[PDB]
A paper describes a structure:
However, PEDF lacks a consensus sequence for the serpin reactive center region and exhibits no antiprotease activity, while being a major neurotrophic factor in the retina that promotes neurogenesis and enhances the viability of photoreceptors, amacrine cells, and other neurons. Interestingly, PEDF belongs to the serpins (SERPINF1), a family of serine proteinase inhibitors other members of which have also been identified as zinc-binding proteins, suggesting that zinc coordination is a common property of this family and may affect ocular proteostasis. PEDF acts through the interaction with cell surface receptors, mainly PEDF-R, which contribute significantly to the survival of retinal cells. Biophysical and X-ray crystallographic studies show that PEDF coordinates zinc ions in five types of intermolecular high-affinity sites, leading to a decrease in negative surface charge and reversible oligomerization of the protein, thereby masking the target recognition sites responsible for its neurotrophic and antiangiogenic activities and collagen binding.
Author numbering: 42 to 418
């Protein structure tokens, strides 16, 4: 009566926080109609889950409902969270993801909050000093350490009015299971919309083995390419050239993506994929204020952290994402029984598309992009 996959606690928690991530993606995309969207919401959800350790029942419950924990009956959801983080940030996954809680200067933190925070989330609080330049330098150094320097350093100054600041950072550069032949990469058309076309570097595999399916309701075609480390990327490509992907965005949930994944079928296709090297640095404070989290910014109860009243004032996100032709090996070339019939398909990502990076074992959303322009911001 229940999908055995989502009965596994880590998989259920992955589904919950990834549903938070798809919600956040929808909010950001609705406010970015003409710009790329690039998010790794797991880091933001992790910052929020960690902060909930320091919250009393009311605020804790608000946070937990935003993270879809209300559908989970677990003895220790924070231990499950530690398991999930250890699984999806292992070396093979090529994903760096880090979360930080930053407190106003001179705040006195209870050790009873520091302890479970370190135990389950592997991070410790950072209390500001009041020197903007040194606080910015220290945050940049923390990001450099966590992301192996693969993210750009920030120049935005730390505001003076900060009670609680959450920081979520993520970087991904993966390796396809099946490399692209760099000799076939060339400049090709990318249709930004019905009336605009640009030239972008485009990787090509004319005989690509991928998992495919066409959704006529959403009027789009879906392809799945595996990556090393037991991950995959699922592309949603509209059938007509358009920047309007809202109907596709509305359907994205952990369970719906699991369904799509299960229903794709193996095929051979003429595949073109644009090279990607994207970055993002921004504030998601207002998006969260729109996501039933407003109470964190007025008068929440974080008395498990400190006796002085504190509140959320800022939530920052920095993300970097990259794929090129790099891959593990070439097509397997296995022995086959003779067959007469082929079923040719074309999958050309030469127009705005959405992509979702997912961990195969847990189903966790690790990265999501609306690519209106592969060249970047
Ligand atoms: Zn024949």
């Amino acid at each position: 009566e229940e999908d055995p996959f989502f009965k596994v606690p880590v998989n259920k928690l992955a589904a919950a926080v990834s549903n938070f991530g798809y919600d956040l993606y929808r909010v950001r995309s609705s406010t970015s109609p003409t710009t790329n969207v690039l998010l790794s919401p797991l880091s933001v959800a992790t910052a929020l889950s960690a902060l909930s350790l320091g919250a009393e029942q009311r605020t804790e419950s608000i946070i937990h409902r935003a993270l879809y924990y209300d559908l989970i009956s677990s003895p220790d959801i924070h231990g499950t969270y530690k398991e999930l983080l250890d699984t999806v940030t292992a070396p093979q996954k090529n994903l760096k993801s880090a979360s930080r809680i930053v407190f106003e200067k001179k705040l006195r933190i209870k050790s009873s909050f520091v302890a479970p925070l370190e135990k389950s989330y592997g991070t410790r609080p950072r209390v500001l000093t009041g020197n903007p330049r040194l606080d910015l330098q220290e945050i940049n150094n923390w990001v450099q350490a966590q992301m192996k320097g693969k993210l750009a350093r920030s120049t935005k100054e730390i505001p003076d009015e900060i009670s609680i600041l959450l920081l979520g950072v993520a970087h991904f550069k993966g390796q396809w299971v099946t490399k692209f032949d760099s000799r076939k990469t060339s400049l090709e058309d990318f249709y930004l919309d019905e009336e605009r076309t640009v030239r972008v570097p485009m990787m090509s595999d004319p005989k690509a083995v991928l998992r495919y399916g066409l959704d006529s309701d959403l009027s789009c075609k879906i392809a799945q390419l595996p990556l090393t480390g037991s991950m995959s990327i699922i592309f949603f490509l509209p059938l007509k050239v358009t920047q309007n992907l809202t109907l596709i965005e509305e359907s994205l949930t952990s369970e719906f993506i699991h369904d799509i994944d299960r229903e794709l079928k193996t095929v051979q296709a003429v595949l073109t994929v644009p090279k990607l090297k994207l970055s993002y640095e921004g504030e998601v404070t207002k998006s969260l204020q729109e996501m039933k989290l407003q109470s964190l910014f007025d008068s929440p109860d974080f008395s498990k952290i400190t006796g002085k009243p504190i509140k959320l004032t800022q939530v920052e996100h920095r993300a970097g994402f990259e794929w090129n032709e790099d891959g593990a090996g070439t097509t397997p070339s296995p022995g086959l029984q003779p067959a007469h019939l082929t079923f040719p398909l074309d999958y050309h990502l030469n127009q705005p598309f959405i992509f979702v990076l997912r961990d195969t074992d847990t189903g966790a959303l690790l990265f999501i992009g609306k690519i209106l322009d592969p060249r970047g911001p």
